[PDB]
Design a protein around this motif. Structure first.
Motif, short mmCIF file in Angstrom:
data_model
loop_
_atom_site.label_atom_id
_atom_site.label_comp_id
_atom_site.label_asym_id
_atom_site.label_seq_id
_atom_site.Cartn_x
_atom_site.Cartn_y
_atom_site.Cartn_z
N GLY B 1 -7.93 -13.74 11.35
CA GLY B 1 -7.73 -13.17 10.03
C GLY B 1 -7.04 -11.82 10.08
O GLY B 1 -6.06 -11.58 9.36
N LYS B 2 -7.52 -10.94 10.97
CA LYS B 2 -6.85 -9.64 11.09
C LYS B 2 -5.41 -9.77 11.57
O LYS B 2 -4.53 -9.02 11.11
CB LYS B 2 -7.63 -8.70 12.01
N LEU B 3 -5.14 -10.69 12.50
CA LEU B 3 -3.78 -10.86 13.00
C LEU B 3 -2.84 -11.33 11.90
O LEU B 3 -1.70 -10.86 11.80
CB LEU B 3 -3.77 -11.83 14.18
N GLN B 4 -3.29 -12.27 11.07
CA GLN B 4 -2.46 -12.72 9.96
C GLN B 4 -2.20 -11.59 8.97
O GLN B 4 -1.08 -11.45 8.45
CB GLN B 4 -3.12 -13.91 9.27
N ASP B 5 -3.21 -10.76 8.72
CA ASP B 5 -3.00 -9.61 7.84
C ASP B 5 -1.96 -8.66 8.42
O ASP B 5 -1.09 -8.16 7.69
CB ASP B 5 -4.32 -8.88 7.61
N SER B 6 -2.02 -8.40 9.72
CA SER B 6 -1.03 -7.52 10.35
C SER B 6 0.37 -8.11 10.27
O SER B 6 1.35 -7.38 10.06
CB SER B 6 -1.41 -7.25 11.80
N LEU B 7 0.49 -9.43 10.44
CA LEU B 7 1.81 -10.06 10.34
C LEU B 7 2.38 -9.92 8.93
O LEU B 7 3.57 -9.62 8.76
CB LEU B 7 1.71 -11.53 10.73
N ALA B 9 1.66 -7.54 6.79
CA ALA B 9 2.04 -6.14 6.63
C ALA B 9 3.36 -5.83 7.32
O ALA B 9 4.16 -5.06 6.80
CB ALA B 9 0.93 -5.24 7.17
N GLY B 10 3.61 -6.44 8.48
CA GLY B 10 4.88 -6.22 9.15
C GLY B 10 6.06 -6.80 8.39
O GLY B 10 7.13 -6.19 8.32
N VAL B 11 5.87 -7.99 7.80
CA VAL B 11 6.93 -8.56 6.97
C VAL B 11 7.23 -7.63 5.80
O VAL B 11 8.39 -7.35 5.48
CB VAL B 11 6.53 -9.96 6.48
N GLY B 12 6.17 -7.12 5.15
CA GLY B 12 6.37 -6.20 4.05
C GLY B 12 7.05 -4.91 4.47
O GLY B 12 7.85 -4.35 3.72
N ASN B 13 6.75 -4.43 5.68
CA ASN B 13 7.47 -3.27 6.21
C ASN B 13 8.94 -3.57 6.41
O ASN B 13 9.79 -2.69 6.21
CB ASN B 13 6.84 -2.82 7.52
N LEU B 14 9.27 -4.80 6.81
CA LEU B 14 10.67 -5.13 7.06
C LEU B 14 11.47 -5.26 5.77
O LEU B 14 12.58 -4.72 5.67
CB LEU B 14 10.79 -6.42 7.88
#
Lengths: 54, 54
Positions: B1-7, B9-14
């Motif tokens: 769950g945390k890993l999917q959240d981080s992914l 967030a990274g897409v949103g950063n991009l």
């Protein structure tokens, strides 16, 4: 698009005339034409003076 | 769950845009567009001055 605009401007530089100079040239040539007409009219009358001698 | 959240967030950063700057740029470019329209409208009138000389 920019290149086409440049080509059109170059054609205008090549062939387009400057009408501001033509505005003065037109009036000058009209005055010159009137004086030329009057001078030729004066020139036509040279033979008439000979009649006075007879 | 945390890993999917981080992914996510990274897409949103991009890809996500920063609309806080966009709010200023929008008004700035609307003003720029108005001045550009007015300047082009002024430039359209260059030929009218020639008529006065005749």
């Amino acid at each position: 698009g920019k290149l086409q605009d440049s080509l059109d401007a170059g054609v205008g530089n090549l062939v387009d005339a400057d009408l501001a100079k033509e505005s003065a040239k037109l009036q000058s040539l009209q005055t010159k034409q009137q004086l030329g007409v009057q001078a030729l009219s004066i020139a036509n009358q040279s033979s008439s003076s000979i009649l006075s001698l007879f």
